[PDB]
């Protein structure tokens, strides 16, 4: 397309979020009594959840194979959400990589000036 692909466009999106400028959210909620960053927690959560849904899948294979479509759908949305969210992480990473590059050019510049 003219812009990148959208997760809501492909299937249902399990969560939404936004972080303020120069501030990050972390809270203490109880599954194993975690006190850690909020985006990462939603992630870990989705992952352990995926693990469990797969265990389910194995079961429904050994007990009743024709039922799998439902469960593999569970799986699919879990993976797609994992990715959409990791994607939300990237633009900052691309920006900071550009930063490090510009920093390299400056370093070459000042070093070349002093050498001259």
């Amino acid at each position: 397309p003219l812009d990148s692909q959208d997760t809501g466009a492909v299937s249902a999106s399990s969560v939404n979020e936004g972080f303020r400028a120069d501030q990050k959210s972390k809270d203490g909620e109880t599954s194993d009594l975690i006190k850690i960053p909020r985006r990462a927690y939603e992630l870990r959560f989705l992952s352990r959840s995926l693990m469990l849904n797969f265990l389910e899948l194995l079961g429904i294979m050994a007990k009743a194979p024709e039922q799998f479509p439902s469960k593999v759908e569970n799986i699919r949305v879990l993976l797609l959400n994992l990715h959409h969210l990791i994607n939300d992480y990237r633009p900052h990473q691309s920006r900071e990589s550009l930063i490090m590059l510009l920093e390299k050019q400056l370093k070459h510049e000042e070093s070349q000036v002093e050498l001259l």
Binding site: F68, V72, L80
Partner: protein, 98 residues
């Protein structure tokens, strides 16, 4: 039908893995992008011997440049010759021309 079930599941899992590669996004190759700002793939040329042999420069030659090349060239023959090991004695007088 039960077997068909097993297989069918495997195919669905492959398919969603395919969609998975379609959904991830990878950090930009800024290097190539900046090279293409200047309209060449600087990488593919420098790297390649067949490029460098068949490469050809842009047609403008700065005539002030080529004078300065000449100056640096003559000057560089002076460098060479002063510290070039072997001059024949009939050649001992030389002019570093234009």
């Amino acid at each position: 039908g039960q077997k068909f079930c097993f297989q069918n599941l495997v195919h669905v899992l492959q398919d969603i893995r395919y969609q998975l590669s379609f959904a991830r996004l990878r950090n930009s190759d800024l290097v190539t992008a900046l090279d293409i700002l200047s309209t060449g793939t600087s990488l593919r040329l420098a790297n390649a011997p067949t490029s460098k042999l068949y490469m050809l420069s842009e047609s403008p030659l700065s005539t002030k440049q080529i004078l300065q090349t000449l100056h640096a060239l003559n000057m560089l023959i002076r460098i060479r010759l002063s510290l070039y090991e072997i001059i024949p004695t009939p050649f001992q007088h030389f002019t570093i021309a234009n």
